[PDB]
Amino acid sequence: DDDIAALVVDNGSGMCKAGFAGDDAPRAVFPSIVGRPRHQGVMVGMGQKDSYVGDEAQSKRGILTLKYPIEHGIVTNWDDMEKIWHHTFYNELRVAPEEHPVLLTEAPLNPKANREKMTQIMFETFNTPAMYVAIQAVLSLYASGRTTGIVMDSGDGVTHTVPIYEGYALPHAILRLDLAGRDLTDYLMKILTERGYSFTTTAEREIVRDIKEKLCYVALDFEQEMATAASSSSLEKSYELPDGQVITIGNERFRCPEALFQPSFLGMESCGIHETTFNSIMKCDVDIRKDLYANTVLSGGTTMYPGIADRMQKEITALAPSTMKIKIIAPPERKYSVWIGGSILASLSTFQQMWISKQEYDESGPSIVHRKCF
Amino acid sequence: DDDIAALVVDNGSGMCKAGFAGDDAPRAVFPSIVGRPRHQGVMVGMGQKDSYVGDEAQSKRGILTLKYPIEHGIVTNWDDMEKIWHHTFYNELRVAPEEHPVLLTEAPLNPKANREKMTQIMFETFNTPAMYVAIQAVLSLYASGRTTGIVMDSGDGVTHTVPIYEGYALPHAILRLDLAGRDLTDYLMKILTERGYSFTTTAEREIVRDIKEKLCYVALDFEQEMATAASSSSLEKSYELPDGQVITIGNERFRCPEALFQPSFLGMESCGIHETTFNSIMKCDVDIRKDLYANTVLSGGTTMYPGIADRMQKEITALAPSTMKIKIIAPPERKYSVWIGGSILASLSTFQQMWISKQEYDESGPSIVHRKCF
Amino acid sequence: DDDIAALVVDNGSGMCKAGFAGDDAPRAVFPSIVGRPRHQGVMVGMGQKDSYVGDEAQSKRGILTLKYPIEHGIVTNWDDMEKIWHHTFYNELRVAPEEHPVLLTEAPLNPKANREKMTQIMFETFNTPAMYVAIQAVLSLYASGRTTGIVMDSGDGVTHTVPIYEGYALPHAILRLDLAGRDLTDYLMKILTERGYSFTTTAEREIVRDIKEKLCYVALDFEQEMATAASSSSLEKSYELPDGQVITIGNERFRCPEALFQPSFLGMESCGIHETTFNSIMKCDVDIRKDLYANTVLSGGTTMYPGIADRMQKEITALAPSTMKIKIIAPPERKYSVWIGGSILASLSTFQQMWISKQEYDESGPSIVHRKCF
Amino acid sequence: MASGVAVSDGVIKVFNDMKVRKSSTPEEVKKRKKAVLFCLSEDKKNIILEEGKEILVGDVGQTVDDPYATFVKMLPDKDCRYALYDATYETKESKKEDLVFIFWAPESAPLKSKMIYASSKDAIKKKLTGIKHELQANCYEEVKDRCTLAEKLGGSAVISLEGKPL
Amino acid sequence: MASGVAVSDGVIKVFNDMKVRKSSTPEEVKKRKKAVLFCLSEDKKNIILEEGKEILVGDVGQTVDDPYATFVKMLPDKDCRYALYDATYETKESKKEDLVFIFWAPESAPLKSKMIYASSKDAIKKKLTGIKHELQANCYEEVKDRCTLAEKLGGSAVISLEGKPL
């Protein structure tokens, strides 16, 4: 309150979030959707005001066309993006941007054209006194107190692999995978439907999100687990629906997370994501490979499914040559680790020296962001 | 007659059907409803025998509770399902199951637990010598003589989209839509009522079914058509009611089919079914998309409304990017195409080699059905 | 037709090719991949026949493990290699090996153990009447009609620097660089993705190959070019996708080739390939260095990008001490120059005298190949 | 359904002939089979080669300059047949040959014969051990057109399907 | 019916104040309006803000620790009024704020005033340009209860509506 609390806006494909410095997690989380007339608006009196940002738009999905301001970690349409920032400060955070400086997150290997322009909008469109751009993968490794290693980041909307050595990400070790958090929610509903439950409208899609944090589990061994499931017994697990019925989930408890590990269930011929992390290591320098195994960090969106840590150890051991130690770094606050890293180092006093200010932008121009980082 | 004519049982949400091999269409079609006491049975002397399967039960709907053995292409309650098979052989087909082997149809992406058990009931409950499980969408594409393509299947009870490449269905390109044939019949009655005709009892619901094949039409262009309708003129079309009155239908001729295309009239915010087929194509591999357009097949239940073929071409052209050829495959026997595909390849001689027999089930067990297909 | 047309098989890391004598280029070109079960085969009925060679296997990459018969110009696994020769004659060329003798290409400084064994397989496994082993770099210099010089060879899979004086390659002037043609295709897709286009599956990787010959360009000056690119204007260039969308490429037109010149974009600390050619010259005898500059030849796989010749002159001039003439030899048929050199001198009549025959191998044995060359 | 027919050894015998060419002298190079028609004999128990109907490469030199037209003439939508045809096309360097199986499955053909044919494609290619490329049309216009054969090729690098039509 | 009232500019003025907070120093953070009461003035031609009745966030620190109770006290079923209240609640990470319009439409309230109010909800939210979430009760028990405010939240992830009641 007063000095410059630091407003942090975290952007991704979906499930964006924001808060204040000194916090242990972000204050508010909202959906990333924008809607305007679709199918002529659905009948009787069309024209009105339509550009809805937030979860109010989710209900309105049938009558409004949704466009993604962010496609898999990048921004293609700026008009949609501006509405999100307006709505976040004025409606979601309910704090004036003018008193508090804003920090914006970025996807790894973010294109250069976008980087100069986002800075440009903050200074003239919202007149923000200070802002900074950070990488979600860098902060997560940073949070554990380790600068050398490889981080598998489960984003709220997109999953990126970004090995980090001395603050520098490896361009030749980074790959983009599109399954992260929101996509799994779609998937969970899809398999739930197969057993015998009715899902035909986008309105009830949101309901399975609640299901995801409470009921997503990872099995120690998938095939052995499948045999246990057929008999049922204690496998079935209770869940709460707003109406009152409880949808029982038995062998779906472990199978859902498995899609990341085993894409074949989806219908994809693509290699599993854990394997994908392994390819990055193979490409990496041989001498530091042993260090990388002891430097692995799990953070973000859907990594919080219980039993996931146990599964990761097993697959990596099978994938790895052998004869060596594999260690996984597990921070208690892994779900909020991406946001948490950004929040704390934004108000100390010596971070004042380092801020990119509005006044500086006016002088040098767009070129300034490239010049002061490292 | 004698060798093994092959009894084919076609199952769906409603309007199930069966016949013999060498036929060009199924011999008999019946409703899928089962009834037991409701509202204490309706007064004076309750207990009796009640479990009615067929259209005799339809009259009895008011005094018997109806349960659906099949819910949108799958079986949840086996007790109801057994009655249907008993009634079909002994009462509807009037042929002994013992001389003739039976073929059972299945919905696309049918759950594994059900697949082993249905096989189990045929071998022990009815002692059938031979049986086989087939997919309605696969046969329809197969019938046209084309193995590569996408089939939109209008089922008698449920509509499924199932693109097929080399006999294999695409798990990532299949979606479940609940409006197909029986539901439209309910809908047709519902809009008929709005104009000024009295429908208040389930007994006369069946009457509109007759109306559906004779009077359902699809307009070349819906909005232009609506303007023509207001003046009336030749739009009004005659129909026969058992009693003698004729219910005249004018602008309802094209509007009913439109509900599939334009769900908004129902009160649904959901995208039109033709559009839904398009989403499957978008998800599909880009290189084969042009081939898919020339490989499209229309088959089943309510696709036989005249003018439907003309409407499909228009919407697909608007939905598609442009600059390319769109071709629709139209088999004369499209209503019976699902059943027809199953009937012919069940008695040649080399289909003897391929049959799953009762004797084999006793040895391997439930596991056998998964093992011999492909 | 009849005397001994000479079948030439050109081997490399990928994109192998073959044809007949008297031709101006090879008749057929195919991918070098071999596949067998991966991830247990992907579900339902595994065992079958799997060992696919050609581009049919490319689609099947998700369900089959691919092994490289050739790793960067050499053969480690012979079992995969045999399938390629079987498939090339019987399925790709569609010509009987028995009537036509086969010529096999080799990478510069090919190990001795491999050289005796490849000869061994042709004589007993395929019973070929005649065969010969040639070097791709030697033929390219030879093609220009010049025996003294240095050739930078852009292979279809691997790039080798091989200065040649009097038919003899210089062992102390040859270095192996792994970026040539197939690798660039992977790279082009990788940077295309960064701008905002979706590539997540190996199936569409092949599509960018088409992009490579049509859209790869080299700029006269890279940094000046980058400034021009930001404004866009006429930089954006159209391309055809099988589906219908056109992916526009603007500043990527010149940047892709630049990776060979400037490895830093990849994330490599390694010196540029053009520079690598220069190191070979520095090591070489000082007196003949001026002759070498006038004897430089550009041939193979991806050297056919327009503007590449213009770029080479600039970098060599900057790298070279000065005060002297630099001349580049440019043969019209440079893409097919490697194959072309082998094709013509295989059927004249006096090349009959020089052939290594099956009959000779039986007498002397494996030792014969070392003895008759020079 | 899965695989309507099991194989009669006849198809393999003729296919094998095409695979090795079975030719040396100028006399039999022209007797090589550019295209062969396959059908299933009555009762549809067995799959064989039709003696009456076939296309020879020698024909282009001998008397007919458009083999891919004769095929169109001898393949009525009225009869449903299986066929193998050699691509024999030029792509701006020289010409090679792609083995393609041509499926003629007209919707309009007599239902009784056509229906077994349609259902038998998995079975017929089952013995084909996976085939490289395929062309399938249910009408004369698709079979007649040069472009459908060219589609397989890619179509942006082929100026002459037969050295003249494109 | 459709929209009983057209707007008098007063509601927008006070609403705008809440939207930007109109605060900087510690002195006015506590003078921010947690809740505001809106009603339609006599003749019901215009909709305005009631000067007499409002709730301040500063009150929790100043002297009253339960703003959501005072609101219950000053909202008799006897009078029908429109209100804006800030959620100010904790969900197991920290706390934010949801803008909610509170509709007080008691059935038992004097019919003459209440009837215009009931009919005016479309008109009142018409100027609200669609509002995020709303709470509506026609009796003291629903307004009094913690759970109704928590229902909006979801209720399975909220241990403390005001940091103590739940």
Resolution in A: 9.0
Give the whole-angstrom CA distance, residue B325 versus residue B289.
Answer: 11
Query: What are the strands, taking DSSP E only, across chain B?
Result: 7-10, 16-19, 28-30, 34-37, 52-53, 64-67, 70-71, 74-75, 102-106, 130-135, 148-149, 151-154, 159-161, 164-165, 168-169, 175-177, 296-299, 328-329, 356-357
Q: Which domains does chain E have, with CATH numbers?
A: 3-166 (3.40.20.10)
Say whether both A183 and A252 belong to one domain. Answer: yes
Q: Cβ(C150)–Cβ(C134) under 8 Å?
A: no
Give the whole-angstrom CA distance, residue C54 versus residue C204.
Answer: 16
Give the whole-angstrom CA distance, residue C354 versus residue D59.
Answer: 39
Helices (H) and strands (E) in chain E, counts: 8, 7
Evaluate whether chains A and D are touching (3 or more beta carbon pairs less than 8 Å apart): no
Contact A202 B270 (CB under 8 A): yes
Q: Cβ(A88)–Cβ(A18) under 8 Å?
A: yes
CB atoms within 10 A of CB E92: 9
- Strand order through the sheet with A159-161: A175-177, A159-161, A151-154, A296-299, A328-329
Unique residue bearing structure tokens 């799994």: A184
State the smallest CA–CA distance between residue B87 and chain C in angstroms. Answer: 35
Characterise B99 by phi-psi region: left (phi > 0), alpha (psi -120 to 50), beta (else).
alpha
Say whether both B91 and B13 belong to one domain. Answer: yes
Say whether both B347 and B286 belong to one domain. Answer: no
Give the whole-angstrom CA distance, residue C136 versus residue C181.
Answer: 15
Residue B134 contacts by C-beta under 8 Å, 6 or more apart in sequence? B103, B104, B105, B106, B341, B342, D1
Token representation of residue C10:
């050109």
Amino acid making up residue A274: H
Amino acid making up residue C266: L
Taking the CA atoms of chain B, what radius of gyration do you get in angstroms?
Answer: 22
CA distance to A156, B235, B250, B345, per residue, from B230 (Å)? 53, 9, 9, 51
Say whether both B210 and B357 belong to one domain. Answer: no
Q: Cβ(C38)–Cβ(C64) under 8 Å?
A: yes
Interface test with A, best of C58, C186, C190 (most A CBs within 10 A): C190
SS3 at position B153? strand
CA distance to A256, B192, C139, per residue, from B220 (Å)? 45, 22, 67
Query: How would you classify the pairing of strands C296-299 and C328-329?
Result: parallel
Token representation of residue C372:
């008759």
Contact A95 E21 (CB under 8 A): yes
Q: Cβ(C52)–Cβ(C64) under 8 Å?
A: yes
CB atoms within 10 A of CB D126: 17
Sign of CA dihedral C73, C78, C83, C85: positive
Give the whole-angstrom CA distance, residue C368 versus residue C360.
Answer: 8
Say whether both C147 and C157 belong to one domain. Answer: yes
Give the whole-angstrom CA distance, residue B21 versus residue B339.
Answer: 10
Unique residue bearing structure tokens 């349960």: B67
Say whether both A10 and A100 belong to one domain. Answer: yes
Evaluate whether chains A and B are touching (3 or more beta carbon pairs less than 8 Å apart): yes
Give ∠ CA B267-B269-B271 in degrees, rounded to 5.
Answer: 120
Unique residue bearing structure tokens 């804006």: E84
Nearest-by-Cβ selection for B269 from A196, A201, A268:
A201
Interface test with B, best of A190, A199, A204, A266 (most B CBs within 10 A): A190
SS3 at position E38? strand
Say whether both C200 and C155 belong to one domain. Answer: no
Token representation of residue C144:
């220009």
- Look at residues E154, E24, E11, E15 and name the one whose alpha carbon lies nearest to residue E91: E154
Nearest-by-Cβ selection for A49 from E93, E97, E129:
E129
State the smallest CA–CA distance between residue B371 and chain C in angstroms. Answer: 6
Query: What torsion do the CA atoms of B192, B195, B196, B201 make, to the nearest 10 degrees?
Result: 30
Amino acid making up residue B118: M
Could you please report the per-residue DSSP string of A13-27? Answer: SS-EEEE-TT-SS-S
Residue where a domain stops, chosen among B239, B271, B303 = B271
Q: Cβ(C361)–Cβ(C128) under 8 Å?
A: no
- Measured between beta carbons, the chain E residues lying within 8 angstroms of A25 are 93-94
Q: Cβ(E45)–Cβ(E107) under 8 Å?
A: no
State the smallest CA–CA distance between residue E87 and chain A in angstroms. Answer: 12
Give the whole-angstrom CA distance, residue B329 versus residue D136.
Answer: 13
Token representation of residue C290:
């001026």
D154 backbone dihedrals φ, ψ, rounded to 5°: 130, -45
Give the whole-angstrom CA distance, residue C60 versus residue C34.
Answer: 10
Characterise A198 by phi-psi region: left (phi > 0), alpha (psi -120 to 50), beta (else).
beta
Q: Which residues pair with B74 in a beta bridge?
A: B71
SS3 at position B297? strand
Unique residue bearing structure tokens 């038998």: D120
DSSP collapsed to 3 states, B86-145:
HHHHHHHHCCCCCCCCEEEEECCCCCHHHHHHHHHHHHHCCCCCEEEEEEHHHHHHHHCC
Nearest-by-Cβ selection for D20 from C1, C28, C96:
C96
Unique residue bearing structure tokens 């086996």: B78
Residue C153 contacts by C-beta under 8 Å, 6 or more apart in sequence? C136, C137, C140, C159, C160, C161, C162, C299, C300, C338
Give the whole-angstrom CA distance, residue C193 versus residue C205.
Answer: 11
- Look at residues D161, D107, D101 and name the one whose alpha carbon lies nearest to residue D136: D101
Q: Cβ(A39)–Cβ(E107) under 8 Å?
A: no
Taking the CA atoms of chain C, what radius of gyration do you get in angstroms?
Answer: 22
- Measured between beta carbons, the chain A residues lying within 8 angstroms of C39 are 262, 264, 271
Residues in C whose CB is inside 8 Å of some CB of B read 44-45, 203-204, 207, 241-245
- B291 by Cβ neighbours in 10 Å (0-12 / 13-18 / 19+) ranks as middle
Residue of chain C with shortest Cα separation from A168: C267
CA distance to A11, A72, A342, per residue, from C200 (Å)? 22, 12, 30
Say whether both B153 and B283 belong to one domain. Answer: yes
Tell me which H or E stretch contains A296.
strand A296-299
Token representation of residue C118:
């490849």
CB contact, 8 Å: D99 with chain C? yes
Q: Give me the number of domains chain A comprises.
A: 3
Token representation of residue B60:
């009895």
Q: Cβ(A90)–Cβ(E19) under 8 Å?
A: yes
Q: Cβ(B108)–Cβ(B174) under 8 Å?
A: yes
SS3 at position B284? coil
Q: Which residues pair with C65 in a beta bridge?
A: C36
Residue where a domain stops, chosen among C256, C271, C286 = C271
Token representation of residue B89:
């052989």
Say whether both C30 and C100 belong to one domain. Answer: yes
Q: Which residues pair with B165 in a beta bridge?
A: B148, B168
- Measured between beta carbons, the chain A residues lying within 8 angstroms of C201 are 268-270
Give the whole-angstrom CA distance, residue C176 versus residue C142.
Answer: 21
Contact A194 B71 (CB under 8 A): no
State the smallest CA–CA distance between residue A151 and chain B in angstroms. Answer: 29
Q: Cβ(B179)–Cβ(B302) under 8 Å?
A: no
CA distance to A9, A78, A114, per residue, from A120 (Å)? 16, 12, 10
CA distance to B4, B8, B98, per residue, from B129 (Å)? 10, 14, 7
Say whether both B141 and B285 belong to one domain. Answer: yes
Q: DSSP secondary-structure letter at A274?
A: H
Contact A230 B270 (CB under 8 A): no
- Measured between beta carbons, the chain A residues lying within 8 angstroms of B178 are 200
Q: Cβ(C250)–Cβ(C229) under 8 Å?
A: yes
- Look at residues C65, C93, C96 and name the one whose alpha carbon lies nearest to residue C202: C65
Residue B10 contacts by C-beta under 8 Å, 6 or more apart in sequence? B16, B17, B18, B26, B105, B136, B156, B338, B339, B342
Give the whole-angstrom CA distance, residue D48 versus residue C192.
Answer: 50
DSSP collapsed to 3 states, chain C:
CCCCCCEEEECCCCCEEEECCCCCCCCEEECCCEEEECHHHCCCCCCCCCCEECCHHHHCCCCEEEECCEECCEECCHHHHHHHHHHHHHHHHCCCCCCCCEEEEECCCCCHHHHHHHHHHHHHCCCCCEEEEEEHHHHHHHHCCCCEECEEEECCCCEEECCEECCEECHHHCEEECCCCHHHHHHHHHHHHHHCCCCCCHHHCCHHHHHHHHHCCCCCCHHHHHHHHHHCCCCCECCCCCCCCCCCECCHHHHHHHHHHCHHHCCCCCCCHHHHHHHHHHHCCCCCHHHHHHCEEEECCCCCCCCHHHHHHHHHHHHCCCCCCCCEECCCCCCCHHHHHHHHCCCCCCHHHHCEEHHHHHHHCCCHHHHHCC
Token representation of residue B205:
């619901």
- Look at residues B363, B361, B374 and name the one whose alpha carbon lies nearest to residue B116: B361
Residue C66 contacts by C-beta under 8 Å, 6 or more apart in sequence? C33, C34, C35, C57
- Look at residues B183, B258, B186, B195 and name the one whose alpha carbon lies nearest to residue B221: B258
Residue A19 contacts by C-beta under 8 Å, 6 or more apart in sequence? A7, A8, A25, A26, A27, A28, A93, A339, A343, E94
Could you please report the per-residue DSSP string of D31-89? Answer: TSEEEEEEEE-TTSSSEEEEEEEEEETHHHHHT-S-HHHHHHHT--TTS-EEEEEE---
Find chains touching chain E: ≥3 CB pairs under 8 Å: A
Q: DSSP secondary-structure letter at B335?
A: T
Give the whole-angstrom CA distance, residue B34 versus residue B57.
Answer: 7
Give the whole-angstrom CA distance, residue A161 versus residue A153.
Answer: 6
Give the whole-angstrom CA distance, residue B103 versus residue B97.
Answer: 11
Residues in A whose CB is inside 8 Å of some CB of E read 1, 19, 23-28, 49, 52, 54, 56, 90-96, 99, 210, 240, 336
- Look at residues B109, B100, B102 and name the one whose alpha carbon lies nearest to residue B72: B109
Give the whole-angstrom CA distance, residue D143 versus residue D136.
Answer: 8
Query: How would you classify the pairing of strands A130-135 and A159-161?
Result: unpaired
Residue A295 contacts by C-beta under 8 Å, 6 or more apart in sequence? A141, A146, A148, A149, A150, A327, A329
B17 backbone dihedrals φ, ψ, rounded to 5°: -150, 160
Residues in B whose CB is inside 8 Å of some CB of A read 71-72, 74, 76, 109, 111, 113, 170-173, 176-178, 262, 264, 268-271
Residue A98 contacts by C-beta under 8 Å, 6 or more apart in sequence? A127, A128, A129
What is the distance in angstroms between the CA of the first residue and the CA of the last residue of chain C?
30
Query: Residues for chain C: how many in total?
Result: 374
CB contact, 8 Å: D154 with chain C? yes
Residue C128 contacts by C-beta under 8 Å, 6 or more apart in sequence? C97, C98, C101, C102, C122, C358
Size of interface A-C (CB pairs under 8 A): 39
Give the whole-angstrom CA distance, residue C35 versus residue C59.
Answer: 11
- The CATH number given to whatever domain includes residue B308 is 3.30.420.40
Give the whole-angstrom CA distance, residue C29 versus residue C10.
Answer: 9
- Look at residues B81, B33, B83 and name the one whose alpha carbon lies nearest to residue B60: B33
State the smallest CA–CA distance between residue D143 and chain C in angstroms. Answer: 21
Give the whole-angstrom CA distance, residue D121 versus residue D103.
Answer: 8
SS3 at position B338? helix
Domain that holds residue B109: 5-136+338-374
Q: Cβ(B4)–Cβ(B128) under 8 Å?
A: no
Give the whole-angstrom CA distance, residue D29 versus residue A148.
Answer: 68
Sign of CA dihedral E151, E155, E158, E161: positive
CA distance to A219, A316, A335, per residue, from A312 (Å)? 11, 6, 17
Give the whole-angstrom CA distance, residue C94 versus residue C25.
Answer: 17
Residue B107 contacts by C-beta under 8 Å, 6 or more apart in sequence? B12, B72, B73, B74, B135, B136, B158, B160
Token representation of residue E125:
């939210």
Give the whole-angstrom CA distance, residue E158 versus residue B251.
Answer: 54
Could you please report the per-residue DSSP string of A148-211? Answer: EE-EEEE-SS-EEE--EETTEE-GGG-EEE--SSHHHHHHHHHHHHHHT----SGGGTTHHHHH
Residue of chain C with shortest Cα separation from A267: C42
Say whether both C94 and C149 belong to one domain. Answer: no
CB atoms within 10 A of CB C49: 8
Q: Cβ(C219)–Cβ(C232) under 8 Å?
A: no
Give the whole-angstrom CA distance, residue A61 versus residue A36.
Answer: 9
Contact A76 C200 (CB under 8 A): no
- Measured between beta carbons, the chain D residues lying within 8 angstroms of B353 are 6
Q: Cβ(A12)–Cβ(A74) under 8 Å?
A: no
Evaluate whether chains C and D are touching (3 or more beta carbon pairs less than 8 Å apart): yes
Token representation of residue E122:
């479309």
CA distance to A59, A91, C340, E14, per residue, from E19 (Å)? 24, 7, 77, 9
Give the whole-angstrom CA distance, residue A212 versus residue A200.
Answer: 19
- Measured between beta carbons, the chain A residues lying within 8 angstroms of B170 are 267
- Measured between beta carbons, the chain D residues lying within 8 angstroms of B169 are none
- Look at residues C282, C268, C356, C276 and name the one whose alpha carbon lies nearest to residue C315: C276
Q: DSSP secondary-structure letter at A266?
A: T
For helices B337-344 and B136-143, angle between their N-to-C axes, nearest 10 degrees: 80
Give the whole-angstrom CA distance, residue B31 versus residue B12.
Answer: 10
Say whether both B43 and B123 belong to one domain. Answer: yes
Way the structure was solved: cryo-EM
Residue C190 contacts by C-beta under 8 Å, 6 or more apart in sequence? none
Give the whole-angstrom CA distance, residue B208 versus residue B215.
Answer: 10
Nearest-by-Cβ selection for E96 from A28, A210, A336:
A28
Nearest-by-Cβ selection for B324 from C203, C204, C244:
C244
Contact B269 A196 (CB under 8 A): no
